[PDB]
Design a protein around this ligand. Structure first.
Ligand SMILES: O=C(O)CC(=O)CC(=O)O
Ligand SMILES: O=C(O)CC(=O)CC(=O)O
Lengths: 128, 127
């Protein structure tokens, strides 16, 4: 894997799915948000204020989340692919409601037979 | 899907995770640096800082205070995918900050020199 860092075609596919994910967040398109998370009990998301274990818990969280005050400005993005089937996506952002905090979002992506999926995610806000 | 938690692979990664946790408590920076992937792509979103590239992470390790190190691990999920990739996610607590619960996420890759962390993210939140 270490011999195949950021193969152009792989990096392009993952970047596309990442943009898809970010677009679905802004429109609260829960169908796409759920589509992009790996459907497995192992999948997990450490959110800004909650820890969710399993796809079912993540999907359930998305159903009960309010689409209000969701906007976020991405400031930095690093997408790295390893071989043909694995990737990480790491971003910094600012959320408009907490202008004094810098946001971090990490995702690990895996290529499944149904396409790229997030297997684990972690979001946090800090003051620098 | 594609070979989830193969016993031998899951055992190797769990061993390296235990190695990492032991090196944190003894502030064994040699082992801490050994376990992070030596690449400019490697990154660590720390509890209080964002570091890009192995050199920035190694530099941070040389200057860090080892004092408030100890922590109770409360949940661990280690998941391996095929033979060469893994994630490790833990929740932890400290008696020194009873109001904060910790999260630590890592993505691991098998290199020719062994398993390495390619990305990590640590954060503390209120209960
Ligand atoms: O607020 C959070 O927990 C993170 C977030 O913006 C939506 C996501 O990336 O799932
Ligand atoms: O104290 C913690 O759990 C987070 C941390 O920075 C140790 C590490 O770098 O793994």
């Amino acid at each position: 894997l270490e011999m195949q860092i950021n193969l152009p075609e792989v990096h392009a596919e993952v970047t596309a799915q990442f943009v898809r994910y970010e677009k679905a967040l802004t429109s609260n398109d829960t169908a796409v948000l759920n589509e992009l998370f790996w459907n497995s009990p192992q999948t997990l998301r450490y959110g800004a204020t909650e820890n969710l274990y399993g796809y079912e818990a993540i999907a359930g969280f998305r159903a009960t989340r309010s689409p209000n005050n969701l906007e976020k400005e991405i400031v930095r993005t690093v997408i790295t692919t390893y071989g043909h089937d694995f990737a990480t996506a790491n971003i910094e952002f600012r959320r408009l409601s907490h202008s004094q905090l810098t946001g971090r979002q990490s995702q690990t992506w895996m290529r499944t037979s149904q396409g790229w999926r997030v297997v684990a995610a972690h979001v946090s806000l800090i003051a620098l």
